[PDB]
């Protein structure tokens, strides 16, 4: 799709995704590390 666009192109909530994902990945890696 990018190579085709490289044909005809055009221009057209307190979730805190990164804040929770950091702790999630930290816990996930720490689990395997401790194991």
């Amino acid at each position: 799709v990018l190579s085709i666009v490289r044909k005809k192109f055009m221009t057209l909530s307190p979730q805190t995704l990164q804040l929770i994902s950091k702790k999630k990945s930290l816990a996930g890696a720490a689990q395997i590390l401790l194991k």
Partner: protein
């Protein structure tokens, strides 16, 4: 003798340092007490394990040219084997003489 125990303790300390680093990272990334001291101790133990490994690798390099310490006292081994064989033959002859004496009496 002591170098073997030294290497064993170095390996155990490297394992303990890895475990301590993992536990410190877990405690520090869980939520935000002793995480700073734990990370400091883990880094210090890792540095100590690295230094011990480097020192053990930088050993005197006794020979590194051929098979060293050739000859494991094989003469003494053979002498001990012959002494044991002599003792066994003496025991057999003594048992034979004892059987003869028992048959006599």
């Amino acid at each position: 003798n002591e170098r073997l125990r030294a290497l064993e303790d170095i390996e155990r300390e490297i394992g303990a340092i890895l475990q301590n680093a993992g536990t410190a990272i877990l405690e520090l990334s869980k939520e935000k007490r002793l995480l700073d001291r734990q990370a400091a101790a883990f880094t210090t133990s890792v540095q100590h394990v690295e230094a011990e490994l480097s020192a053990q690798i930088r050993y005197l390099t006794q020979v590194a040219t051929g098979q060293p310490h050739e000859g494991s006292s094989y003469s003494s081994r053979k002498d001990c084997q012959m002494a044991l064989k002599r003792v066994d033959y003496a025991r057999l002859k003594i048992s034979d003489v004892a059987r003869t004496c028992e048959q006599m009496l």
